[PDB]
Design a binder for this molecule. Structure first.
Ligand SMILES: CCC1=C(C)/C(=C/C2=NC(=C\c3[nH]c(/C=C4\NC(=O)[C@H](C)[C@H]4CC)c(C)c3CCC(=O)O)/C(CCC(=O)O)=C2C)NC1=O
Ligand SMILES: CCC1=C(C)/C(=C/C2=NC(=C\c3[nH]c(/C=C4\NC(=O)[C@H](C)[C@H]4CC)c(C)c3CCC(=O)O)/C(CCC(=O)O)=C2C)NC1=O
Ligand SMILES: CCC1=C(C)/C(=C/C2=NC(=C\c3[nH]c(/C=C4\NC(=O)[C@H](C)[C@H]4CC)c(C)c3CCC(=O)O)/C(CCC(=O)O)=C2C)NC1=O
Ligand SMILES: CCC1=C(C)/C(=C/C2=NC(=C\c3[nH]c(/C=C4\NC(=O)[C@H](C)[C@H]4CC)c(C)c3CCC(=O)O)/C(CCC(=O)O)=C2C)NC1=O
Ligand SMILES: CCC1=C(C)/C(=C/C2=NC(=C\c3[nH]c(/C=C4\NC(=O)[C@H](C)[C@H]4CC)c(C)c3CCC(=O)O)/C(CCC(=O)O)=C2C)NC1=O
Ligand SMILES: CCC1=C(C)/C(=C/C2=NC(=C\c3[nH]c(/C=C4\NC(=O)[C@H](C)[C@H]4CC)c(C)c3CCC(=O)O)/C(CCC(=O)O)=C2C)NC1=O
Ligand SMILES: CCC1=C(C)/C(=C/C2=NC(=C\c3[nH]c(/C=C4\NC(=O)[C@H](C)[C@H]4CC)c(C)c3CCC(=O)O)/C(CCC(=O)O)=C2C)NC1=O
Ligand SMILES: CCC1=C(C)/C(=C/C2=NC(=C\c3[nH]c(/C=C4\NC(=O)[C@H](C)[C@H]4CC)c(C)c3CCC(=O)O)/C(CCC(=O)O)=C2C)NC1=O
Ligand SMILES: CCC1=C(C)/C(=C/C2=NC(=C\c3[nH]c(/C=C4\NC(=O)[C@H](C)[C@H]4CC)c(C)c3CCC(=O)O)/C(CCC(=O)O)=C2C)NC1=O
Ligand SMILES: CCC1=C(C)/C(=C/C2=NC(=C\c3[nH]c(/C=C4\NC(=O)[C@H](C)[C@H]4CC)c(C)c3CCC(=O)O)/C(CCC(=O)O)=C2C)NC1=O
Lengths: 160, 162, 57, 161, 49, 49, 162, 162, 162, 162, 160, 162
């Protein structure tokens, strides 16, 4: 998280935390309640985001569900939905932590190798994450929507 | 190496489930203690040199043989090594204070220190006494609320090296 | 206080490496006394675990 | 690391005499089988990714290890498992071309079990993955080369197991 | 990279002879490279003393 | 504008590898001559060419 | 580096068109001498030290001043460096012969050779004479047909130096 | 400057030695090559404008970025500078070929050219390409025997720039 | 690299002066634009791959010889290298816009770039065209004021390469 | 030497593109500020001697050791050279302001100035102080806007020296 | 062998064996019958080759048999014949192996010190192995002699 | 790197006492024996190669099974290790003799040697026989006065190996 990164930076050159690191930690903890409220809203309605994003992705890329596609089949579609659920949970984790370190550490480092093993088209990741971002930003207010969409943006860039 | 937030993220991620309300309550706890933690951290950063001063002074006062010949602190090099160890312990205790978790202590302090001291022959009891000497004075400067909260990390270091 | 025999395992958390790096992860070296503090700190910052250290000489 | 040629030369060096008829027979048995070994090696080289992918799928994909709480659950951890399967396939190909398992014992199994214990890697699931890779390689390369490669995959399996 | 152009011949420091009474002594690129190229433009006017 | 320049060399990017270039660079990387295996491989390459 | 094959492939790739008659003629000429060049390379790789011995003997017999005091080859270190340079030249000439292209010479010998020898004070003309002596010895060793193929790259090196 | 005759004379003068059989052999070699050198020099003098013409056209055809806007050769001034440099290169290569020695190339051209080009921003790869253009253009005009002689001086210029 | 705040600090430190009214006015001007800069940077990080796609498409449409044989983008390897260079330019221009100063551009991109391309053979003018194309592509996505601010740094890159 | 108009012309010639709306916009902005620039330049020219007088008086009052024995401005010769240098700085700052581009400063003023002063022994810091005093004097005469304009060039000179 | 060198080179770059290294191995295994036949052809005439090599060695360097030499005396001859036998055996091992390595470990790494201790001149070794080269190349066919000569004069060059 | 002079300082520093008359006497003893230690070390270094010659000859005559195939010393590499081990034993015996303390032997030879030899299959008793053959020639060369001193170190290595 934010305090984790500050502590790592301070310990890297073997010193106590800089005043700037203390200010960034204060800024993090001061906005912790709003982050937890965003976590409320995203966690409660998870089904809406996941299903609407799946529908938007499948409409945008019909070849995925078409025969010969990676998502073709009921089990493969279920795996698609489970992957979207994983990424939504990680986005909520990063929202709470104040950094994208949970998203990265859990499901970004080595994501390309895994999806190469699965033949998963990374543009499919990008479009699914963009649909998730659209739904999440729609269900939130503007001040929250921008900050939340930043995390989806980072995830999409990591997949792309 | 993880704080309270990343610790709860890990314990909820391993189960594969989303955050529950109890997780949010635990998170509100740390967010509510954050400003006190940062204030104590600033105080300790300001007073680290003085804390080392008085902690080394008290440790060498209660145990005189350490500085005297035949003691496990009797050398300029060995004296510097002891004070360096105490300074590192204080800094990592403050780190664990800010993070709210003792994982950093395991990953960056107790990682190989126990058997290093065992091979070197450093007495465990004297090290625990030095940890206590630092804790009971640092708690005086940081305030009672932050005193009780550094208590867990300092006696964690003591029990780990024990 | 001459030498330390150190066995430690530093895993990889930042990426996945294509080369071997098996002996780079799990290894035992002899480290000089004046260098053991810095080496132990480096192993700890890397995230590795110091399994055991003994005294050689 | 040594091959069959290096092995027989080492034995006849220690015993201190020239290469006799039996050594020639072993060397011919290695040489005439060479063309099959290079065909198998080329087949594995061209289709290594497909072999590892099919093996990982059938052995690991929908097992609990991929789900959270398992050793394979992360992008990094899953990529690391596929990477280790790549290791096994490549070094089994090397051992098959060298016709000796000392390469597998040394380059791969030297300290691997301790590393897997410390990291938390399950040994039994690794044995299952190595086995599945063995049948995938046998299927792709045909029975004759599959029998040869099964010896090295089984050497890996008993090394971990 | 972070400072203005040097006091240098526009074709490099090896193009400047030693200001001795006689001799025409120049630095060589090959005996010891010691070559500093400078992006001196066509309108740069040297500062002479 | 740039305040200073380091100079321009002639880079040799590698487009792809040939069998002959591969063998020669394998010999050169170890700063050695050709072993019988490399000689036989090169002879076979010139035979199949 | 480049060889004849890479040169032709690039020449016709930049034009964007298949091999014409001249291309196939170049490749056939390159392949025709391939076995002869590989035989010569095997001879040189096998007998490099011998060639160095006669080349150095001829060079230092023709110019005894080099190994007498005040000469650039007067010490054990500088004599060893001289024969080491000669081994460099022989090996890179063999590389160039097998490649069929002088790109490797320009890339990995001539690039910095003049700077090195003018900094160290090495006599360039004497180095050319040593290269010529090496050419003569290796031509006597590997046969006239391979002697010409060695001599073209030996001349390339000699012209690069002088 | 220095030619082959003067080179031999200076070597024997620094040795304080007399003209031996080897010296007279080298002198005979130069006198044997002299008529070819003079014919090549006259031919190159006749067609120097044509050689610069064709070499410039080919270099700018292979690398058209130079003459398009933003190129090092894009202006009348910079194009004329490129042509002037190529005319020097041809004239001084002809001087070196007629002399039989590359000392003139070193001292008059190559001593300071890299730093001049690096300060001017002139590409050196493209300049070497232009030198090779002049090389194989003049090779056709002088003939194979004279081409083999002028090529070593063109390669000397190229190696000095590279 | 240095940002606007660091630039003002340096200018006032080399003069040994405290901040006057002009300094605080300039710092306030930079602070007023911070949120716009952050929003623009987020928008660019949103569509970086997109912007690269349209910029490369426009560049190779208006410069078709780049992808034809003899062009420097004629390869999948060279195409990938070109689009990675485009990625560099976009990333560092976004860094400069976020900082509010062109120092990072000069330090990490422009210094040594012309000589790097001269060694590699990369056309500087075509790279400038690609940077401009990136500018028109980015302006529409970022809006009017963000386009003015962001195109200032693209113009700095183009002028430095020019 | 290049002004804003010349800079636009060059940045469009490097591209090879004709003028479009953006270039006309930048030129229009330069003509918009041209009247301010001309009035400021005329005012500075009318009072150059006065500006030098108060600037040198302020510098030598703040640093009296400069004109006392042992100071670098202790001689009629060195004092005259000092006020001559101050006149240089004022005149070339006026040139740069009238051109709207800092190119002339790098081009005719700051090039080799550090080496020149360091060889002479001139205090660089005191020269910067003289430039700042000249800035303060010039601002009051030219008014607020013209002072803000001239300040960027004076600060450019001060940062180039320091 | 050639296979071991190819495997080591491939492992150095963390890649599968290249087609150049692959057809190197292909030529190595396709030439196995000829190399084994050559190795035997050396084997039957071991005593003949060794005795003729010793004779030529004495003829070329009388100093070894001359008074005061390291090989002077009748007792030294028993070791001479046996050592030439070792080196011929190593040559055959290298022939079957396809490279010079078995010779390298068994008789070359440490030969300099081994004869420094015994005060054995390197030129004596090079002339003796040159004698074996001449005798063997006389016995073998031209195509086989070309291949075996490399190992022989490699031993010669390594001995000095 | 332990010495008798260093040992007495370490002892007095660990027990925290000044110089005594016992240290005075033993330091006189070391200083007085020092000259004969010098001559012994010089004589051994003079004949170290000859000593290794004779010891290896005696060992290989006593037990030829090592040099013949199937023995631990049947390889040029293994013979190199064989003589290198004897050279190391002689050198470190001389080092201990100059030091006057056997701690150097324990620190750099004996510890881990038995396990290493057992792992590599090296025969311990054969190495002890070699050490005995070494000590007899060394004692013959140095003379009885230095033979007695060298004997204790060789016996100490032999006892440690056994
Ligand atoms: C939290 C970190 C993490 C992630 C992200 C992860 C992804 C993941 N998705 C998988 C399957 C899958 N994933 C997908 C979804 C993709 N294919 C379609 O084309 C779509 C474009 C796209 C969805 C938007 C599909 C179709 C499968 C089934 C493939 C198969 O089983 O062969 C698998 C194979 C094992 C299994 O399904 O149990 C993994 C490991 N695993 C992890 O531990
Ligand atoms: C960041 C976590 C961490 C720490 C703190 C750490 C300390 C540490 N202390 C050491 C020795 C030492 N440590 C001490 C301190 C102890 N002895 C007594 O004074 C006290 C009871 C006690 C201090 C509380 C002393 C005196 C030495 C030198 C003794 C010797 O030379 O053997 C060494 C051996 C290497 C060296 O000194 O150069 C280490 C690595 N290592 C780590 O990875
Ligand atoms: C060439 C010889 C070689 C081998 C064999 C090898 C194994 C190996 N696997 C590792 C990590 C790993 N390996 C695995 C795979 C395991 N988890 C799955 O469930 C399976 C049961 C099983 C594999 C079949 C995983 C998940 C990790 C990551 C563990 C972690 O970092 O926490 C690591 C630590 C370094 C890294 O993460 O890059 C090594 C050294 N390395 C080598 O150089
Ligand atoms: C007034 C200040 C000044 C001095 C002194 C000076 C020295 C000087 N001596 C030169 C030549 C020389 N100078 C010497 C003298 C030395 N070599 C012998 O061995 C002696 C040991 C030793 C003199 C005692 C020689 C032999 C040369 C000829 C070298 C050559 O021309 O290459 C040259 C080359 C230019 C020319 O000869 O016209 C210079 C510049 N230059 C100056 O501007
Ligand atoms: C393949 C690329 C390559 C080349 C070409 C090369 C040449 C080279 N020769 C050197 C030394 C040397 N080279 C020579 C050359 C001999 N001097 C005699 O007069 C002869 C004329 C001549 C050979 C026939 C000498 C004498 C030295 C030692 C000079 C000194 O160190 O003082 C050095 C200095 C580094 C060192 O001593 O190890 C280089 C770089 N090195 C390379 O990596
Ligand atoms: C911006 C300053 C500038 C100019 C003006 C310029 C002119 C220029 N004219 C060229 C050729 C040419 N120029 C002309 C034009 C002539 N044909 C007739 O005789 C007419 C009298 C006359 C036109 C009215 C022609 C026909 C060629 C082609 C010649 C050839 O291809 O060999 C070329 C060579 C193009 C290349 O190598 O790719 C240039 C660079 N270059 C510059 O950097
Ligand atoms: C052998 C090595 C090699 C090949 C073949 C290659 C193909 C290639 N074709 C391209 C253009 C293109 N290529 C195509 C499609 C064609 N592409 C083919 O595979 C189809 C047969 C066919 C359509 C059915 C199209 C439509 C474009 C235009 C650019 C775009 O797709 O947006 C490009 C992008 C550069 C450009 O815009 O011109 C590449 C890299 N690159 C290489 O280094
Ligand atoms: C060694 C060479 C040298 C000289 C000559 C010299 C003169 C000199 N006189 C000065 C001031 C002055 N000098 C005078 C003298 C004038 N008052 C009357 O009008 C007379 C006509 C005339 C004297 C007879 C006055 C009145 C000032 C004060 C100017 C002021 O502060 O406004 C100053 C300004 C700096 C200072 O006050 O210390 C200098 C440099 N400095 C030198 O380094
Ligand atoms: C396969 C690796 C290997 C080699 C090569 C080897 C050679 C070898 N030759 C030896 C003796 C010797 N060998 C020679 C023969 C040579 N010395 C003279 O300088 C002549 C130049 C030349 C004969 C013409 C001599 C003179 C001795 C010493 C006494 C003796 O004859 O046994 C010895 C010492 C003990 C013994 O006789 O076995 C060795 C180890 N041993 C090995 O394990
Ligand atoms: C610091 C001082 C030091 C010691 C004490 C030392 C002992 C030592 N002996 C070794 C091997 C060896 N040592 C010997 C020598 C023994 N075997 C023979 O039969 C003789 C009876 C006897 C000699 C008297 C041999 C033959 C080997 C080779 C074993 C092998 O190849 O693995 C090795 C491993 C090196 C290798 O195998 O390449 C060590 C470390 N090394 C040291 O640096």
């Amino acid at each position: 998280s934010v305090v984790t990164k500050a502590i790592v930076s301070a310990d890297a050159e073997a010193r106590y935390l800089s005043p700037g690191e203390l200010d960034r930690i204060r800024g993090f903890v001061s906005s912790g309640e709003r982050r937890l409220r965003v976590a409320q809203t995203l966690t409660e309605s998870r089904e809406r985001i996941i299903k609407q994003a799946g529908d938007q992705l499948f409409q945008k890329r019909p070849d995925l569900v078409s025969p010969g596609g990676n998502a073709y089949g009921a089990e493969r579609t279920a795996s698609c939905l489970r992957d979207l659920d994983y990424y939504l949970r990680l986005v909520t984790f990063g929202i709470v932590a104040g950094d994208v370190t949970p998203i990265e550490e859990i499901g970004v480092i080595g994501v390309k190798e895994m999806y190469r093993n699965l033949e998963v088209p990374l543009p499919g990741m990008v479009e699914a994450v963009k649909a998730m971002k659209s739904v999440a930003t729609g269900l939130l207010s503007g001040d929250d929507s921008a900050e939340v969409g930043y995390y989806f943006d980072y995830l999409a860039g990591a997949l792309a | 190496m993880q704080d309270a937030i990343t610790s709860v993220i890990n314990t909820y991620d391993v189960q594969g489930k989303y955050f529950d309300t109890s997780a949010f309550d635990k998170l509100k706890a740390y967010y509510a203690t954050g400003e006190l933690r940062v204030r104590a951290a600033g105080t300790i950063s300001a007073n680290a040199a003085t804390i080392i001063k008085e902690a080394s002074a008290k440790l060498f006062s209660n145990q005189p043989d350490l500085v005297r010949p035949g003691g496990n602190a009797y050398t300029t090099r060995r004296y510097a090594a002891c004070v360096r160890d105490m300074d590192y312990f204080l800094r990592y205790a403050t780190y664990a204070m800010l993070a709210g978790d003792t994982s950093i202590l395991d990953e960056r302090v107790l990682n190989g220190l126990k058997e290093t001291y065992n091979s070197l022959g450093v007495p465990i009891s004297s090290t625990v006494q030095g940890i206590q000497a630092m804790k009971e004075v640092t708690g005086s400067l940081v305030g009672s609320g932050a005193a009780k909260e550094m208590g867990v990390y300092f006696d964690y270091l003591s029990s780990g090296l024990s | 206080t001459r030498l330390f025999k150190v066995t430690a395992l530093i895993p990889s958390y930042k990426k996945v490496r294509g080369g071997r790096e098996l002996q780079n992860t799990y290894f035992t070296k002899l480290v000089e006394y004046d260098r053991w503090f810095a080496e132990q700190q480096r192993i700890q910052k890397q995230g590795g675990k110091i399994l055991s250290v003994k005294m050689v000489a | 690391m040594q091959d069959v040629i290096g092995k027989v030369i080492a034995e006849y060096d220690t015993k201190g005499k020239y290469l006799d008829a039996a050594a020639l027979d072993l060397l011919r048995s290695y040489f005439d089988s060479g063309d099959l070994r290079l065909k198998a090696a080329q087949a594995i080289t061209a289709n290594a990714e497909v072999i590892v992918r099919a093996a990982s799928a059938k052995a690991l994909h929908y097992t609990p290890v991929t789900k959270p709480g398992g050793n394979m659950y992360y992008a990094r951890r899953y990529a690391s498992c596929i990477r280790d399967l790549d290791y096994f396939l490549r070094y089994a190909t090397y051992a098959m071309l060298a016709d000796n398992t000392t390469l597998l014992d040394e380059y791969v199994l030297k300290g691997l079990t301790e590393t897997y214990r410390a990291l938390g890697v399950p040994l039994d699931i690794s044995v299952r993955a190595i086995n599945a890779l063995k049948e995938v390689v046998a299927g792709q390369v045909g029975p004759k080369a599959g029998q040869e490669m099964a010896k090295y995959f089984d050497h890996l399996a008993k090394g971990l197991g | 990279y972070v400072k203005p152009l040097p006091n240098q011949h526009p074709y490099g420091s090896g193009n400047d002879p030693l200001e001795i009474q006689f001799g025409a002594i120049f630095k060589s690129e090959t005996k010891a490279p010691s070559a500093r190229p400078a992006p001196i433009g066509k309108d740069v006017q040297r500062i002479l003393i | 504008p740039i305040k200073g320049t380091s100079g321009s060399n002639i880079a040799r990017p590698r487009f792809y590898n040939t069998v002959m270039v591969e063998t020669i660079e394998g010999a050169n990387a170890e700063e050695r001559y050709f072993n019988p295996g490399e000689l036989s491989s090169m002879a076979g390459f010139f035979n199949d060419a």
